[PDB]
Protein backbone atom coordinates (compact mmCIF):
# COMPACT_ATOMS: atom_id res chain seq x y z
CA UNK A 1 0.00 0.00 0.00
CA UNK A 2 3.15 2.11 0.05
CA UNK A 3 3.87 4.48 -2.86
CA UNK A 4 7.67 4.11 -2.69
CA UNK A 5 10.14 1.22 -2.37
CA UNK A 6 11.04 2.19 1.18
CA UNK A 7 12.92 -0.36 3.19
CA UNK A 8 10.95 -2.40 5.62
CA UNK A 9 12.29 -2.32 9.14
CA UNK A 10 11.69 -4.98 11.78
CA UNK A 11 13.08 -5.97 15.18
CA UNK A 12 12.18 -9.65 15.60
CA UNK A 13 13.20 -10.32 19.22
CA UNK A 14 12.48 -12.96 21.93
CA UNK A 15 9.75 -10.70 23.25
CA UNK A 16 8.09 -8.36 20.76
CA UNK A 17 8.10 -7.91 16.99
CA UNK A 18 8.31 -4.27 16.02
CA UNK A 19 7.64 -3.23 12.49
CA UNK A 20 7.10 -0.26 10.19
CA UNK A 21 8.70 1.32 7.15
CA UNK A 22 11.95 3.21 6.85
CA UNK A 23 11.49 6.92 7.21
CA UNK A 24 8.87 6.77 9.96
CA UNK A 25 9.56 7.64 13.64
CA UNK A 26 7.86 4.62 15.15
CA UNK A 27 6.89 1.05 14.26
CA UNK A 28 3.40 1.04 12.79
CA UNK A 29 2.55 -2.08 14.74
CA UNK A 30 4.00 -4.07 17.60
CA UNK A 31 2.99 -7.59 18.66
CA UNK A 32 4.64 -10.65 20.44
CA UNK A 33 6.93 -13.05 18.56
CA UNK A 34 4.50 -15.92 19.04
CA UNK A 35 3.31 -18.91 17.06
CA UNK A 36 0.69 -20.92 18.97
CA UNK A 37 -0.55 -24.48 18.53
CA UNK A 38 -3.61 -26.42 19.89
CA UNK A 39 -2.85 -28.71 22.82
CA UNK A 40 -6.31 -30.36 22.66
CA UNK A 41 -8.27 -32.82 20.52
CA UNK A 42 -11.06 -31.29 18.44
CA UNK A 43 -14.59 -32.69 18.76
CA UNK A 44 -16.87 -30.33 16.83
CA UNK A 45 -17.00 -30.60 13.01
CA UNK A 46 -16.84 -27.62 10.62
CA UNK A 47 -15.10 -25.40 13.18
CA UNK A 48 -12.34 -24.15 10.90
CA UNK A 49 -9.30 -24.22 13.25
CA UNK A 50 -5.73 -23.59 12.26
CA UNK A 51 -2.76 -25.87 12.82
CA UNK A 52 -0.97 -22.81 14.15
CA UNK A 53 -1.84 -19.21 15.08
CA UNK A 54 0.37 -16.13 14.79
CA UNK A 55 0.98 -13.02 16.92
CA UNK A 56 -2.25 -11.61 18.25
CA UNK A 57 -4.08 -14.64 16.87
CA UNK A 58 -1.91 -16.83 19.05
CA UNK A 59 -2.75 -14.82 22.10
CA UNK A 60 -6.46 -14.39 21.24
CA UNK A 61 -7.06 -18.16 20.97
CA UNK A 62 -4.46 -19.07 23.66
CA UNK A 63 -6.98 -20.74 25.98
CA UNK A 64 -6.22 -24.06 24.20
CA UNK A 65 -2.82 -23.31 22.66
CA UNK A 66 0.74 -23.79 23.80
CA UNK A 67 2.65 -20.65 22.83
CA UNK A 68 6.20 -20.66 21.50
CA UNK A 69 8.68 -17.86 20.83
CA UNK A 70 10.99 -18.69 17.78
CA UNK A 71 13.74 -16.35 19.01
CA UNK A 72 15.81 -17.62 21.92
CA UNK A 73 17.57 -14.84 23.84
CA UNK A 74 18.32 -12.97 20.62
CA UNK A 75 18.79 -15.85 18.11
CA UNK A 76 16.39 -17.34 15.60
CA UNK A 77 16.10 -21.08 15.77
CA UNK A 78 12.53 -21.76 14.72
CA UNK A 79 12.78 -20.13 11.33
CA UNK A 80 9.50 -21.73 10.18
CA UNK A 81 7.52 -20.01 12.86
CA UNK A 82 9.37 -16.81 12.10
CA UNK A 83 8.45 -17.08 8.42
CA UNK A 84 4.83 -17.02 9.67
CA UNK A 85 5.54 -14.06 11.98
CA UNK A 86 7.16 -12.09 9.15
CA UNK A 87 4.40 -12.92 6.72
CA UNK A 88 1.83 -11.75 9.26
CA UNK A 89 3.89 -8.63 10.15
CA UNK A 90 4.31 -7.60 6.55
CA UNK A 91 1.05 -8.62 4.88
CA UNK A 92 -1.62 -8.50 7.64
CA UNK A 93 -0.33 -5.38 9.42
CA UNK A 94 1.97 -3.20 7.33
CA UNK A 95 0.30 -4.39 4.10
CA UNK A 96 3.61 -4.53 2.31
CA UNK A 97 5.35 -7.33 0.52
CA UNK A 98 9.20 -7.75 0.95
CA UNK A 99 9.35 -8.74 -2.71
CA UNK A 100 8.79 -5.01 -3.53
CA UNK A 101 10.92 -3.57 -0.65
CA UNK A 102 14.53 -4.02 0.68
CA UNK A 103 14.45 -5.28 4.32
CA UNK A 104 16.42 -4.40 7.45
CA UNK A 105 16.59 -6.72 10.49
CA UNK A 106 18.76 -6.30 13.58
CA UNK A 107 20.90 -8.17 16.18
CA UNK A 108 23.36 -7.54 19.08
CA UNK A 109 27.15 -7.21 18.19
CA UNK A 110 28.06 -10.59 19.85
CA UNK A 111 24.97 -12.41 18.62
CA UNK A 112 26.01 -15.82 17.04
CA UNK A 113 26.51 -15.52 13.26
CA UNK A 114 23.90 -18.17 12.61
CA UNK A 115 21.18 -15.60 13.37
CA UNK A 116 22.28 -13.18 10.66
CA UNK A 117 22.73 -15.98 8.13
CA UNK A 118 19.32 -17.54 8.71
CA UNK A 119 17.48 -14.23 8.66
CA UNK A 120 19.20 -13.39 5.37
CA UNK A 121 18.40 -16.79 3.89
CA UNK A 122 14.72 -16.73 4.61
CA UNK A 123 14.04 -13.21 3.53
CA UNK A 124 15.76 -13.90 0.18
CA UNK A 125 14.46 -17.43 -0.45
CA UNK A 126 10.90 -17.44 0.92
CA UNK A 127 9.94 -13.75 0.64
CA UNK A 128 12.06 -12.91 -2.44
CA UNK A 129 13.20 -9.62 -0.93
CA UNK A 130 15.31 -7.63 -3.51
CA UNK A 131 17.84 -6.79 -0.80
CA UNK A 132 18.86 -7.40 2.81
CA UNK A 133 20.76 -5.73 5.62
CA UNK A 134 21.35 -7.07 9.13
CA UNK A 135 21.98 -4.15 11.43
CA UNK A 136 23.58 -3.93 14.79
CA UNK A 137 21.11 -3.21 17.63
CA UNK A 138 23.76 -1.07 19.35
CA UNK A 139 24.15 1.06 16.24
CA UNK A 140 20.47 1.51 15.97
CA UNK A 141 20.12 2.23 19.70
CA UNK A 142 22.55 5.12 19.51
CA UNK A 143 21.08 6.46 16.26
CA UNK A 144 17.67 6.72 17.88
CA UNK A 145 19.03 8.36 21.03
CA UNK A 146 21.28 10.79 19.12
CA UNK A 147 24.76 9.65 20.00
CA UNK A 148 27.94 8.63 18.19
CA UNK A 149 29.55 8.02 21.53
CA UNK A 150 28.13 6.13 24.50
CA UNK A 151 27.27 2.78 26.07
CA UNK A 152 24.42 0.81 24.71
CA UNK A 153 22.36 -0.60 27.50
CA UNK A 154 19.78 -2.62 25.60
CA UNK A 155 18.41 -4.56 28.67
CA UNK A 156 15.37 -6.09 26.85
CA UNK A 157 13.67 -9.48 26.87
CA UNK A 158 16.50 -11.51 25.32
CA UNK A 159 19.99 -10.48 26.43
CA UNK A 160 21.69 -7.37 27.84
CA UNK A 161 24.55 -6.41 25.45
CA UNK A 162 26.53 -3.59 27.19
CA UNK A 163 28.66 -2.16 24.29
CA UNK A 164 30.82 1.00 24.22
CA UNK A 165 30.94 2.90 20.93
CA UNK A 166 33.22 5.97 20.42
CA UNK A 167 32.91 8.39 17.49
CA UNK A 168 30.97 5.74 15.59
CA UNK A 169 33.61 3.00 16.27
CA UNK A 170 33.19 -0.17 18.22
CA UNK A 171 35.37 -0.81 21.22
CA UNK A 172 34.61 -4.60 21.15
CA UNK A 173 37.06 -5.80 23.78
CA UNK A 174 34.97 -3.98 26.34
CA UNK A 175 31.64 -5.60 25.43
CA UNK A 176 30.08 -7.33 28.42
CA UNK A 177 27.39 -9.62 26.89
CA UNK A 178 25.24 -10.70 29.84
CA UNK A 179 22.76 -13.52 30.34
CA UNK A 180 20.35 -11.36 32.36
CA UNK A 181 17.12 -10.21 30.71
CA UNK A 182 13.41 -9.29 30.83
CA UNK A 183 12.60 -12.95 29.97
CA UNK A 184 14.26 -14.13 33.20
CA UNK A 185 12.35 -11.57 35.17
CA UNK A 186 9.05 -13.04 33.94
CA UNK A 187 10.03 -16.52 35.12
CA UNK A 188 11.48 -15.25 38.39
CA UNK A 189 8.29 -13.34 39.15
CA UNK A 190 6.28 -16.57 38.50
CA UNK A 191 8.44 -18.25 41.21
CA UNK A 192 8.17 -15.46 43.84
CA UNK A 193 4.41 -15.14 43.22
CA UNK A 194 4.32 -18.92 43.92
CA UNK A 195 5.92 -18.06 47.31
CA UNK A 196 2.90 -15.79 47.96
CA UNK A 197 0.40 -18.61 47.31
CA UNK A 198 -0.31 -17.94 43.62
CA UNK A 199 1.52 -20.59 41.61
CA UNK A 200 2.19 -19.89 37.91
CA UNK A 201 3.70 -22.65 35.68
CA UNK A 202 1.82 -22.79 32.26
CA UNK A 203 1.86 -20.58 29.13
CA UNK A 204 -1.32 -18.81 30.10
CA UNK A 205 0.12 -18.25 33.53
CA UNK A 206 3.40 -16.98 32.05
CA UNK A 207 1.50 -14.49 29.85
CA UNK A 208 -0.41 -13.39 32.97
CA UNK A 209 2.84 -12.86 34.85
CA UNK A 210 4.40 -10.97 31.94
CA UNK A 211 1.39 -8.65 32.15
CA UNK A 212 1.75 -8.28 35.92
CA UNK A 213 5.39 -7.38 35.50
CA UNK A 214 4.81 -4.89 32.67
CA UNK A 215 2.05 -3.09 34.64
CA UNK A 216 3.11 -3.35 38.35
CA UNK A 217 6.92 -3.55 38.47
CA UNK A 218 9.66 -1.04 39.21
CA UNK A 219 13.21 -1.21 40.59
CA UNK A 220 13.45 1.84 42.98
CA UNK A 221 16.49 3.98 43.70
CA UNK A 222 17.15 2.38 47.12
CA UNK A 223 16.32 -1.34 47.11
CA UNK A 224 16.85 -2.19 50.74
CA UNK A 225 14.73 0.69 51.96
CA UNK A 226 11.94 -0.05 49.48
CA UNK A 227 12.18 -3.71 50.55
CA UNK A 228 12.01 -2.89 54.24
CA UNK A 229 8.78 -0.96 53.84
CA UNK A 230 7.17 -3.25 51.22
CA UNK A 231 7.85 -6.22 53.45
CA UNK A 232 6.34 -4.43 56.47
CA UNK A 233 3.24 -2.68 55.11
CA UNK A 234 0.28 -2.92 52.73
CA UNK A 235 0.98 0.70 51.76
CA UNK A 236 3.43 -0.50 49.08
CA UNK A 237 1.20 -3.28 47.72
CA UNK A 238 -0.58 -3.20 44.40
CA UNK A 239 -3.27 -5.49 43.14
CA UNK A 240 -3.59 -7.07 39.74
CA UNK A 241 -6.70 -8.43 38.08
CA UNK A 242 -6.26 -11.75 36.31
CA UNK A 243 -8.12 -12.71 33.05
CA UNK A 244 -10.34 -15.09 35.00
CA UNK A 245 -11.39 -12.54 37.65
CA UNK A 246 -8.91 -13.65 40.32
CA UNK A 247 -7.07 -10.94 42.16
CA UNK A 248 -3.48 -11.15 43.24
CA UNK A 249 -1.98 -8.67 45.67
CA UNK A 250 1.75 -8.15 45.19
CA UNK A 251 4.16 -6.56 47.73
CA UNK A 252 7.92 -6.52 47.60
CA UNK A 253 7.89 -8.95 44.66
CA UNK A 254 6.88 -5.89 42.68
CA UNK A 255 10.50 -4.74 42.85
CA UNK A 256 12.38 -7.84 44.04
CA UNK A 257 11.88 -9.27 40.58
CA UNK A 258 13.26 -6.24 38.66
CA UNK A 259 16.02 -5.88 41.29
CA UNK A 260 17.56 -9.05 39.76
CA UNK A 261 18.93 -6.63 37.16
CA UNK A 262 21.19 -5.22 39.93
CA UNK A 263 21.34 -8.49 41.90
CA UNK A 264 21.47 -11.39 39.35
CA UNK A 265 22.17 -13.87 42.13
CA UNK A 266 18.40 -13.85 42.73
CA UNK A 267 18.08 -16.11 39.64
CA UNK A 268 21.35 -17.97 40.21
CA UNK A 269 23.41 -15.85 37.81
CA UNK A 270 27.08 -15.20 38.33
CA UNK A 271 26.95 -11.46 37.84
CA UNK A 272 27.51 -8.15 39.60
CA UNK A 273 24.52 -6.54 37.87
CA UNK A 274 23.91 -4.26 34.89
CA UNK A 275 25.50 -1.23 36.55
CA UNK A 276 28.81 -3.00 36.95
CA UNK A 277 28.88 -4.27 33.42
CA UNK A 278 28.24 -0.72 32.26
CA UNK A 279 31.03 0.51 34.52
CA UNK A 280 33.58 -2.07 33.43
CA UNK A 281 32.84 -1.61 29.73
CA UNK A 282 33.89 1.99 30.23
CA UNK A 283 36.83 1.23 32.54
CA UNK A 284 38.32 -1.10 29.87
CA UNK A 285 38.37 1.83 27.36
CA UNK A 286 41.17 4.46 27.13
CA UNK A 287 40.97 7.45 29.50
CA UNK A 288 40.27 9.87 26.61
CA UNK A 289 37.24 7.73 25.77
CA UNK A 290 35.98 7.21 29.35
CA UNK A 291 35.26 10.89 29.86
CA UNK A 292 32.65 10.74 27.07
CA UNK A 293 31.26 7.28 27.76
CA UNK A 294 30.53 7.89 31.46
CA UNK A 295 28.54 10.99 30.58
CA UNK A 296 26.59 9.02 27.93
CA UNK A 297 25.26 5.71 29.26
CA UNK A 298 22.33 5.15 26.89
CA UNK A 299 19.19 3.13 27.53
CA UNK A 300 17.39 1.07 24.90
CA UNK A 301 15.07 -1.92 25.16
CA UNK A 302 12.57 -2.97 27.86
CA UNK A 303 13.18 -2.95 31.66
CA UNK A 304 14.71 0.55 31.08
CA UNK A 305 11.20 1.78 31.47
CA UNK A 306 11.05 0.72 35.17
CA UNK A 307 10.78 3.59 37.69
CA UNK A 308 14.14 4.12 39.37
CA UNK A 309 16.18 2.27 36.70
CA UNK A 310 18.08 5.23 35.24
CA UNK A 311 18.61 6.68 38.66
CA UNK A 312 19.56 3.32 40.14
CA UNK A 313 22.19 2.62 37.51
CA UNK A 314 23.49 6.17 37.48
CA UNK A 315 23.90 6.04 41.28
CA UNK A 316 25.80 2.76 41.20
CA UNK A 317 27.99 3.74 38.26
CA UNK A 318 28.69 7.09 39.93
CA UNK A 319 29.60 5.31 43.18
CA UNK A 320 32.06 3.05 41.31
CA UNK A 321 33.34 5.87 39.03
CA UNK A 322 35.98 8.50 39.99
CA UNK A 323 35.01 12.03 41.12
CA UNK A 324 35.22 15.37 39.13
CA UNK A 325 34.06 13.50 36.03
CA UNK A 326 30.33 13.46 35.40
CA UNK A 327 28.30 10.28 35.07
CA UNK A 328 24.92 10.35 33.31
CA UNK A 329 22.19 8.08 31.96
CA UNK A 330 20.32 9.00 28.84
CA UNK A 331 16.88 7.42 29.02
CA UNK A 332 14.55 8.95 26.40
CA UNK A 333 10.72 8.25 26.24
CA UNK A 334 11.32 6.46 22.94
CA UNK A 335 12.29 3.54 25.17
CA UNK A 336 11.76 -0.16 24.36
CA UNK A 337 10.95 0.81 20.75
CA UNK A 338 14.02 2.99 20.04
CA UNK A 339 16.00 0.30 18.26
CA UNK A 340 13.22 0.11 15.66
CA UNK A 341 13.54 3.86 15.23
CA UNK A 342 17.26 3.49 14.83
CA UNK A 343 16.52 0.91 12.07
CA UNK A 344 14.43 3.54 10.26
CA UNK A 345 17.27 6.03 10.64
CA UNK A 346 19.84 3.60 9.24
CA UNK A 347 17.62 2.28 6.47
CA UNK A 348 16.92 5.82 5.25
CA UNK A 349 20.52 7.20 5.35
CA UNK A 350 21.99 8.05 1.93
CA UNK A 351 25.30 6.69 3.24
CA UNK A 352 23.61 3.36 3.84
CA UNK A 353 22.33 2.64 0.37
CA UNK A 354 25.58 1.00 -0.63
CA UNK A 355 25.39 -1.40 2.36
CA UNK A 356 22.61 -3.62 0.99
CA UNK A 357 23.06 -7.25 -0.05
CA UNK A 358 21.20 -7.46 -3.33
CA UNK A 359 19.32 -10.53 -4.58
CA UNK A 360 22.08 -11.30 -7.06
CA UNK A 361 25.05 -11.27 -4.76
CA UNK A 362 22.97 -13.36 -2.40
CA UNK A 363 22.33 -16.20 -4.79
CA UNK A 364 25.85 -16.24 -6.16
CA UNK A 365 27.34 -16.49 -2.62
CA UNK A 366 24.51 -17.93 -0.49
CA UNK A 367 23.38 -16.56 2.97
CA UNK A 368 26.90 -16.64 4.43
CA UNK A 369 27.34 -13.41 2.44
CA UNK A 370 25.76 -11.44 5.27
CA UNK A 371 28.90 -12.13 7.32
CA UNK A 372 30.99 -10.13 4.84
CA UNK A 373 28.53 -7.52 3.50
CA UNK A 374 26.86 -6.10 6.60
CA UNK A 375 29.68 -5.47 9.11
CA UNK B 1 21.55 23.40 19.34
CA UNK B 2 19.69 26.13 21.23
CA UNK B 3 17.24 26.18 18.37
CA UNK B 4 16.28 22.67 19.39
CA UNK B 5 15.35 24.01 22.73
CA UNK B 6 13.43 26.83 21.15
CA UNK B 7 11.62 24.36 18.88
CA UNK B 8 10.78 22.29 21.92
CA UNK B 9 9.26 25.29 23.61
CA UNK B 10 7.41 26.23 20.44
CA UNK B 11 5.82 22.84 20.12
CA UNK B 12 5.19 22.52 23.82
CA UNK B 13 3.54 25.88 24.11
CA UNK B 14 1.59 25.44 20.92
CA UNK B 15 0.63 22.10 22.42
CA UNK B 16 -0.04 23.68 25.76
CA UNK B 17 -2.56 26.02 24.36
CA UNK B 18 -3.98 23.32 22.10
CA UNK B 19 -4.12 21.11 25.18
CA UNK B 20 -5.60 23.55 27.64
CA UNK B 21 -8.29 23.90 25.05
CA UNK B 22 -8.46 20.22 24.06
CA UNK B 23 -8.30 18.96 27.61
CA UNK B 24 -11.09 21.21 28.71
CA UNK B 25 -13.13 21.25 25.53
CA UNK B 26 -12.90 17.58 24.86
CA UNK B 27 -14.28 17.00 28.30
CA UNK B 28 -16.83 19.74 28.14
CA UNK B 29 -18.08 18.52 24.86
CA UNK B 30 -18.06 14.83 25.74
CA UNK B 31 -19.09 15.32 29.34
CA UNK B 32 -21.82 17.86 28.86
CA UNK B 33 -23.12 15.94 25.85
CA UNK B 34 -22.97 12.78 27.96
CA UNK B 35 -24.84 14.15 30.90
CA UNK B 36 -27.32 15.95 28.70
CA UNK B 37 -27.85 12.71 26.82
CA UNK B 38 -27.93 10.55 29.84
CA UNK B 39 -29.92 13.02 31.91
CA UNK B 40 -32.49 12.42 29.23
CA UNK B 41 -31.85 8.70 29.20
CA UNK B 42 -32.23 8.71 32.97
CA UNK B 43 -35.48 10.62 32.74
CA UNK B 44 -36.83 8.45 29.95
CA UNK B 45 -35.95 5.32 31.85
CA UNK B 46 -37.62 6.72 34.96
CA UNK B 47 -40.71 7.54 32.94
CA UNK B 48 -40.78 4.10 31.43
CA UNK B 49 -40.22 2.56 34.84
CA UNK B 50 -43.17 4.45 36.22
CA UNK B 51 -45.25 3.45 33.26
CA UNK B 52 -44.32 -0.19 33.72
CA UNK B 53 -45.11 -0.01 37.43
CA UNK B 54 -48.53 1.37 36.43
CA UNK B 55 -48.88 -1.34 33.78
CA UNK B 56 -48.09 -4.00 36.36
CA UNK B 57 -50.71 -2.58 38.73
CA UNK B 58 -53.27 -2.59 35.93
CA UNK B 59 -52.51 -6.21 35.06
CA UNK B 60 -52.75 -7.18 38.71
CA UNK B 61 -56.28 -5.76 38.73
CA UNK B 62 -57.06 -7.56 35.44
Amino acid sequence: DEDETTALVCDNGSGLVKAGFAGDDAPRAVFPSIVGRPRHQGVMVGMGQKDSYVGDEAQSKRGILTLKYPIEHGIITNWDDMEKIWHHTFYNELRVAPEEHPTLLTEAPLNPKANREKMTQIMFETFNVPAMYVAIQAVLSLYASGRTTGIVLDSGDGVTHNVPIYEGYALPHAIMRLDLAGRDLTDYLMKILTERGYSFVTTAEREIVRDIKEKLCYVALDFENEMATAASSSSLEKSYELPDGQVITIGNERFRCPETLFQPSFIGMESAGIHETTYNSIMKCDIDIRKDLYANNVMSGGTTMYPGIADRMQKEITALAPSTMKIKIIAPPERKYSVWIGGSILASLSTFQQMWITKQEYDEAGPSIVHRKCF
Amino acid sequence: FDDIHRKRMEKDLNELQALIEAHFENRKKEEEELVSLKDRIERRRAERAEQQRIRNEREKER
Partner: peptide, 29 residues
Protein backbone atom coordinates in the same frame (compact mmCIF):
# COMPACT_ATOMS: atom_id res chain seq x y z
CA UNK C 1 0.27 12.72 33.60
CA UNK C 2 1.49 13.03 30.01
CA UNK C 3 2.10 16.70 30.52
CA UNK C 4 4.36 15.80 33.35
CA UNK C 5 6.09 12.94 31.73
CA UNK C 6 7.40 15.30 29.10
CA UNK C 7 7.77 18.40 31.28
CA UNK C 8 9.64 16.18 33.71
CA UNK C 9 12.05 15.10 31.09
CA UNK C 10 12.40 18.69 29.92
CA UNK C 11 13.13 20.10 33.32
CA UNK C 12 15.31 17.32 34.56
CA UNK C 13 17.36 17.58 31.42
CA UNK C 14 17.39 21.33 31.37
CA UNK C 15 18.33 21.66 35.03
CA UNK C 16 20.88 18.94 34.80
CA UNK C 17 22.40 20.58 31.81
CA UNK C 18 22.23 24.00 33.42
CA UNK C 19 23.75 22.56 36.57
CA UNK C 20 26.43 20.79 34.62
CA UNK C 21 27.13 24.18 33.07
CA UNK C 22 27.13 25.88 36.50
CA UNK C 23 29.54 23.37 37.86
CA UNK C 24 31.84 23.51 34.84
CA UNK C 25 31.70 27.23 34.60
CA UNK C 26 33.22 27.48 38.03
CA UNK C 27 35.23 24.21 37.97
CA UNK C 28 37.13 25.16 34.85
CA UNK C 29 38.87 27.85 36.95
Amino acid sequence: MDAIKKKMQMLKLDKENALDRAEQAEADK
